[PDB]
Amino acid sequence: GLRQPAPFSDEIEVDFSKPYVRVTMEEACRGTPCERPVRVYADGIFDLFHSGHARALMQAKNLFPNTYLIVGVCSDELTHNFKGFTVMNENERYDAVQHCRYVDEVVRNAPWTLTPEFLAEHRIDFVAHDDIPYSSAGSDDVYKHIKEAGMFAPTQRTEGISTSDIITRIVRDYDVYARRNLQRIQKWEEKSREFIGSFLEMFGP
Amino acid sequence: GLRQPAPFSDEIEVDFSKPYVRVTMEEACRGTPCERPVRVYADGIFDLFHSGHARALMQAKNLFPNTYLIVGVCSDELTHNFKGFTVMNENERYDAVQHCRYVDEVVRNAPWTLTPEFLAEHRIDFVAHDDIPYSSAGSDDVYKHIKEAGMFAPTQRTEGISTSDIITRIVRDYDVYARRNLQRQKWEEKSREFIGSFLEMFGP
Ligand SMILES: C[N+](C)(C)CCOP(=O)([O-])OP(=O)(O)OC[C@H]1O[C@@H](n2ccc(N)nc2=O)[C@H](O)[C@@H]1O
Ligand SMILES: C[N+](C)(C)CCOP(=O)([O-])OP(=O)(O)OC[C@H]1O[C@@H](n2ccc(N)nc2=O)[C@H](O)[C@@H]1O
Incomplete structure (x- = not known):
């Protein structure tokens, strides 16, 4: 097992008496x-x-x-x-x-x-x-x-998981949730699909 | 280092010829x-x-x-x-x-x-x-x-981070983003109440 975290590039001592050689x-x-x-x-x-x-x-x-x-x-x-x-x-x-x-x-x-x-x-x-x-x-x-x-x-990419998904899971839930308490609209129910997608555009492709 | 994931409890064998004995x-x-x-x-x-x-x-x-x-x-x-x-x-x-x-x-x-x-x-x-x-x-x-x-x-808890915090970042911006696009009222006053209530659902 591992007790300690991963070294940053900085912490580590590197040697240039060691030339650069990749492998095959x-x-x-x-x-x-x-x-x-x-x-x-x-x-x-x-x-x-x-x-x-x-x-x-x-x-x-x-x-x-x-x-x-x-x-x-x-x-x-x-x-x-x-x-x-x-x-x-x-x-x-x-x-x-x-x-x-x-x-x-x-x-x-x-x-x-x-x-x-x-x-x-x-x-x-x-x-x-x-x-x-x-x-x-x-x-x-x-x-x-x-x-x-x-x-x-x-x-290979894992399926069903991604940062967009984790965001859309949350955002989807808050959208309906917020609007519900406002009632306590019709264009939102229409634009809700439109808003969420646009929102996640801001987070990339 | 470590090339493979962590076993589950069931996925591993356990020998009960060993009685349960704790340690100080x-x-x-x-x-x-x-x-x-x-x-x-x-x-x-x-x-x-x-x-x-x-x-x-x-x-x-x-x-x-x-x-x-x-x-x-x-x-x-x-x-x-x-x-x-x-x-x-x-x-x-x-x-x-x-x-x-x-x-x-x-x-x-x-x-x-x-x-x-x-x-x-x-x-x-x-x-x-x-x-x-x-x-x-x-x-x-x-x-x-x-x-x-x-x-x-x-x-010891770390700080500045917790599962509730990651929600509010994402949530907050969306409360204001949606409303912003919406105009294309009074939501602002209640806005803080909303989010707070939303995070109550995930726990304290
Ligand atoms: C900026 N670059 C191009 C230099 C680095 C790549 O940037 P990026 O946007 O691919 O980074 P990322 O954090 O989205 O992805 C990190 C790595 O995790 C992998 N990944 C990501 C999500 C997912 N569900 N499965 C994955 O296998 C991606 O293939 C990637 O190789
Ligand atoms: C319900 N139990 C008691 C059976 C299991 C514990 O439930 P929980 O609500 O503590 O789970 P959790 O996911 O909130 O916390 C998991 C673990 O991460 C630690 N943790 C979490 C967040 C944080 N900022 N600092 C932490 O140290 C907690 O001490 C805890 O030991």
Whole structure:
């Protein structure tokens, strides 16, 4: 079992007498020595941290026999810009992921698009996300180049769970509930369907 | 690290050739030889599983040098009955806890009140929860009897976070957003009463 949370990128002592060398799917799947695990990077908002996230993170932890899971979490600032609102701000979301079971390391304030230097800095061998193209402004897929590098490792999305769902579950209930106490309208019953959807647009795609 | 989730209670084998024998704070804090960890029970709804929960569990895991953390998760039925609603469904919250870092095994469909024979089958050495007396049912504290056995290990609530808080953030903005679009009166005065009432349904 684990008694303590996951190290932030900062806490950890890293060595540049160690050159940057990735591994190959074959070399990684044959499985790595204990001193040299495979290093994988998964990224996201992780708003309303839930099972869908955690399973993806488990998928990611298990890609190879010996693996080190690092997880980039984006800032509120970057997220509100390119995506929509978070219900929970970055610190809560930083704390959340630290408590996940398969998480070795947390990377704060992580970049929307990944750069050669980020990958070199954090010594990343592969990258874990779902195989849908991510369109964030200017790009049809922001993982395209990581895919092309052969660096990309796809994952599977859990069904029935998502941050939109958790929001729509609540909002749907309050909508009818508020209006009910107002009675104690007709256009609302019509626009209720219209309002809720629009509301969740603000939270992304 | 850990590549796999937490077992459930049933999913694991248990050998009853071992009689039920608890352990004192003393020889527990002295530390427990490997094959005999200390077994601690923490319980809750874990609706909207969050970091207040997760750290609560971390303390629980850390109460002793060698500690086995069992965590019970109460049913929708029990919860809707004795507490209020859950936006998360019992099967969802069963899954949530599985992915927590400090949790060795999960116990589905937990009791609202803990019983001698429940503590017997799960071989529970101690119990971790906050020291605020828990009043539901007719009990003004449901842990009092567990307290009195000296079997209780308190924990500390995190702050700024709780399952009720995540509701109000989401809720609030929508109360004002809807009304805003609505114009396309007097709701403002009552608005605070509304939200408050809405969160009463999920508990205190
Ligand atoms: C901004 N990026 C593109 C750099 C990082 C990706 O941003 P994002 O919006 O995909 O982050 P997110 O928090 O929505 O998703 C985190 C990860 O959890 C996975 N996920 C999410 C929800 C869900 N029900 N099942 C999942 O498997 C997604 O595939 C993703 O790989
Ligand atoms: C009903 N019981 C007593 C049988 C089980 C306990 O029910 P509960 O209402 O305490 O469950 P809950 O989900 O509200 O709390 C779960 C656990 O997380 C901890 N917790 C929760 C929120 C928070 N901000 N800080 C915390 O430390 C609580 O101490 C509790 O131990």
